[PDB]
Symmetry: D2
Subunit: 418 residues, 4 copies
């Protein structure tokens, strides 16, 4: 165990009394509202979100990167750190890998994962940067590059990601590329998209039937004029064109200012193309900040659509959940811990919505009560439920407090080169 | 003739020598660039854009409306004013009607149009406002309203618009509604969209074999939280679901901040669902300003996509263009005149792009020369072409100057009581 | 009383048990956090926000207006409705008037206000629309219009607003105009601003010693290319130029997409130019939606800056608080009630922030714990505190539910003629 | 001469005939508008904009950097490339240095500059990144950092920049920092600003009597929640607080979506705090794209304000203009060349505005004719003037064409490492 069990027990005992008081109080409040707190905690204990291997190390901007102490070197150190997040929150049993950054012996990866109590989520291909010894540069694109050999190289790389994923237990390939243009006229919009579609079709041919192929849209960056997979509309066309196993991945920070993202989620669900989510928060662009740190209500509204879907009985609805963030000014482990917590927080609150009451207010066009019905759920402080779920499943009542009391950061700082 | 022919002749002849000088100078320049000015002028003469009947009246905001003199009241006054725009620019032969604002005896409407030299473009339904004696209010929606009777009333109204259009020569119905919500939870996104699709399917059934049904997306306003037909993504789902006769209308000012609109145009063209483009300009929201008055280059880039499709062929490409603006601080006739001019200006410049050279630079990923190739066309002052095209077709060399010299505004001001 | 006391009493009794349980539970939780819930409730029950007279009637857009039943006939009906909001929430004792919309004999306005237990907040001038009989139109501007006589007309109107306010107990004038341009070149940015500053100085000259002049910036609408008072930068230049009695009014929905509004608030406070707030919520533009219905955290963050001002010891800081919203698809009274509630909600949460802990995390650059410190306050459900504050002050535990139980809307619907 | 004079001559003679024709044609056109093309050309030959030393190297994003061949290594290589831009465009005689990147013997820099025919513009400090051996990290800020020792280090660095500038002929220091926060609560907005103002006051004390101190605002990036110097309002407070020698720098891509940037320019000029303008273009955020490649009209409108200032007779107005761009997918030298050209293009068009006619239309509130007055200037293709201006001053008629014909890139690619 990355974190000593005695430290976990000690820090849980220190806060056990208060938690009992808060949990029983919330339990009584919920019972008065016709909700069984135990039913909610039971569901919360089953909600999982994948952590990004590339998010365990300190992130940076084009201006600078300010690493902290004990930075993980390689995927093995990263898995060790991810193990801490799972142990304390119990909400991140799976890790999402990025190739070639995390390329290593599949048997070893799988072996280390099993030892750490971690599984592997969707693989992530990388054709938005050049690796050492690469034959063709992705400077002007990859899967949609004008040069056939470059597209071929990109397709092969993606197929390799599938091979690695199959060996470790992954069940999906997420494809996000920077392909686009920085100048009007640089790219022929339609021809570029045609090349992309043809390349993805080749990747789709190599996709196992138990896998999903996720395409991720993004309005801009690295391309600053146009992007091939720029929004959910183009993304839908891609998924629909490719096949039943192809779906769209929605990253919260990849939309134009003021976009109603939760509606995008609902539309994709209605047409069976909501592959999964990339959680994070933002205020200006693709800021990649800790989930819920900027607009917690928006996060709740997205989950409201997810919970409504299940309520409406949508079949085969098992969207993938992943955190896609960059931690530039905090301890990556702490941020991922609290981000995973915020995701479960939004989910739990969405579970509290009185669906029957809401349905009634929507049908009668009682906008005020309809919105207040959502607010009654959102305003509820579900921390006691989150903390109890962790406590009952081997985690920490207060993950960050236990993390800091363990001295893990100082430990790995002493074991890893500065 | 709304404007005395002798006035047009007079104003044109005084400027004839100057125009000839500019036309010949530009011709020599285009000749050196391997372009035949005559070929461009010929195409410009045949580019038309519909004028909205409601556009000749002074517009306003929710804060106030400041009418000018001689305001047209009713469709008859409006057609009289629209006739001026066509006579002077020769780029707006067809008018788009709005029901019930323009309700009148179909035979009278058609007779008046024929007399003024005006045809009728797409009909526009109105279920975003309540008419006197209306059985059900559209306060909470229309085609997507939760009340079955309300949706039925909206459907019948649209069918009635088709019946009126059939009687006057129209071949399409444009559907733009305000349907949406101002509060989270007020509407169930998916159910509202399902209701909308079901209602539109009924309207689709009353569509003659040679008619088209256009759905128009808008991010927000009048709904300030969510809008059923909020973007081109939803618009595409609508058109594809309804059938071959259903297409999407792209209104420039209806997109989120920083949206790459020309790409949306390309995407719709590729999948055969670009029903038409609604021209106007904007800086903040759906400002409905004179086309090209704010971002003339963006207008050119949209036309670059239209000309590429117009030239390279492309199946199902028969866009029905219309100007959709609000004139709050100018003479509506003058603004529509210059907006129509600006639209032809961007078209003309798009026709100057060296397609072969551009394609070459795109294939070689020569971004700088690709963008410069577009700029060489855009930087060209094609006013001489626009003016000569008008002169050859019965219009005015300088439309606004001629309009002012005619004293038309003062004339209608004396005929119409403020 | 607009709302029968027996109804308020009955609806309060019906919910007494649940409130006791929730309030006492919250109180114990706060105590464990070193917070005295009684101290918080005591401050909450004293937080007031002015209600707009123009907000009690149903609003609309340029596309349409869909009135409900019992729409107020004039200012007197509007005051009657504002009295309902105050009686039930006890958070809106003052009303903001708009001239000429609310023109009437000052003596009578004051008399009705006194009778209903309502006071009057800042006056609001109107030179963004033309009233009957004006010598000059405001189509191309007002205080910054190129025509000298038009600017003078606008100044005199504002001076008249001050006279009305003086007679009814108001102590400030808020100036928001639509002045700007829809086309590049239409206006000379600098000349228009110079004209505006000059005119505003004459309005300032007419201010009593104890009055304030608030200028309100807005990025766009009605002007769609440029606006004379477009942002807080220009607004600061205005207030600083006019004098000590001139301050800036920040309306939440009047900023560019993604603007960090709470920072603007902090900057204005630092330089003593934060006159007050116009509360509302939005997602796209100046949506004028119910406060907190879209981004409740942003509202909390704005209040975090207001409370921090006190924590830093800023002297003579008494910003004016007003709700400026448009209720297009709800009963205006209910939206104003819940908006006032949402404002007290954010204020209450800001009061819960452990300022001592936050200062520490800020100094040592512990960003995660610093943000979590704000969240611990924001995540707290303070509804019990709000409800108790109302109970103690003669209000309703659940304002909207009580309003609906009273049948007030159906009553005024039968009393007021629908416009024809 | 970085570029062989024989090449410049040959490439000019090859295009001299066409240029003569277009120039005379434009001259006749302008004469009819009461404008002497020679007077315009004379002023254009005198318009200069500084080039960023760091702009000649290929830029990148946080995702990747795709360097081209012959990447400059060190300030001396960079000056060699800047010389090419100045030689061919004759519009960029001054270079802006960045410390510590361009640190070198002031005597040698000056000597190399004089030899290349280049001068030096404003110095640029760097406290948005950490350098080796640095005592205190700027991870959590610099001039506004909570740690006094860190702020002192930042101050000393800026003073060092002034000393270096005093030795090479610079007359200003530009200060742009990343200081800000990524999370609500992380920073106290007021305290952070107070710390910044106090640190800047110390830097101001190191300014010679004839120097300027420029502060540059930016809405976001690297800070994603709040930025100390976030907009022009805060920037004004800074300049007004520091003193007469402190002014504001307006970088085009550093504003919120839809911001009216030209108004900000006008406001700063009115209050004497417009230190200078940083040119570039953008569509989404701080894209740092080639000037005028996305919104050429906006660039023209900014120049309309700069030219109006002269027309109004504003005293002591000597703005320090510089190009601040990132060239990620083109040859840096070619982009800077066309960007400088675009800047002169906008300036020239601004000079064509009929100020008398414009003020007349502004006074009578003739919005349509006022905007058309600006458009008459903007629609004028001034390329012949720009080209002739270059030809007469030793530059190239077609800069990029000559640059490519010279083979400079391949040349330095062989002299420099990969
Ligand atoms: Mn992602
Ligand atoms: Mn991303
Ligand atoms: Mn439209
Ligand atoms: Mn519109
Ligand atoms: Mn307001
Ligand atoms: Mn407003
Ligand atoms: Mn800059
Ligand atoms: Mn920049």
């Amino acid at each position: 165990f990355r974190i000593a069990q005695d430290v976990v027990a000690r820090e849980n005992d220190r806060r056990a009394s208060a938690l009992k008081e808060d949990y029983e109080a919330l339990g009584a409040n919920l019972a008065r509202r016709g909700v069984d707190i135990e039913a909610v905690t039971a569901k919360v204990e089953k909600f999982f979100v994948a952590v990004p291997s590339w998010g365990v190390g300190t992130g940076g901007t084009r201006f600078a990167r300010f690493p902290g102490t004990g930075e993980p070197r390689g995927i093995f150190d990263k898995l060790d750190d991810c193990a801490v997040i799972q142990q304390l929150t119990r909400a991140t049993p799976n890790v999402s890998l990025h190739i070639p950054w995390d390329k290593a012996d599949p048997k070893e990866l799988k072996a280390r994962g099993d030892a750490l109590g971690l599984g592997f989520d969707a693989m992530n291909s990388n054709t938005f940067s050049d690796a050492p010894g690469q034959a063709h540069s992705y400077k002007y694109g990859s899967l949609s590059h004008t040069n056939a050999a470059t597209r071929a190289q990109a397709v092969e790389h993606n197929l390799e990601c599938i091979e690695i994923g199959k060996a470790i237990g992954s069940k999906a390939l997420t494809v996000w590329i920077g392909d686009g243009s920085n100048f009007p006229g640089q790219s022929n919009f339609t021809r570029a998209f045609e090349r992309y579609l043809s390349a993805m079709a080749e990747i789709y041919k190599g996709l196992p039937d138990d896998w999903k192929l996720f395409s991720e849209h993004k309005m801009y960056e690295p391309a600053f004029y146009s992007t091939v997979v720029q929004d959910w509309g183009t993304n839908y066309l891609i998924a629909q064109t490719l096949g039943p196993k192809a779906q769209c991945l929605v990253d919260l920070g990849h939309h134009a200012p003021n976009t109603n993202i939760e509606m995008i989620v609902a539309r994709l669900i209605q047409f069976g193309k909501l592959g999964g989510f990339h959680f994070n928060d933002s205020k200006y662009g693709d800021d990649d900040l800790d989930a819920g740190a900027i607009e917690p209500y928006r996060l709740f509204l997205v989950f409201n659509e997810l919970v409504d879907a299940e309520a409406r009985g949508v079949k085969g609805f098992h969207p993938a959940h992943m955190i896609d963030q960059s931690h530039n000014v905090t301890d990556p482990i702490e941020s991922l811990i609290n981000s995973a917590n915020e995701i479960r927080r939004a989910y739990a609150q969405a579970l509290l919505v009185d669906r029957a009451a809401l349905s009634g207010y929507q049908e009668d066009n009682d906008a005020l009560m309809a919105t207040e019905t959502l607010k009654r759920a959102y305003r509820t402080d579900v921390e006691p439920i989150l903390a109890e779920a962790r406590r009952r499943t081997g985690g920490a009542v207060d993950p960050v407090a236990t993390y800091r009391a363990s001295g893990y950061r100082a430990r790995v700082a002493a074991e890893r080169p500065a």
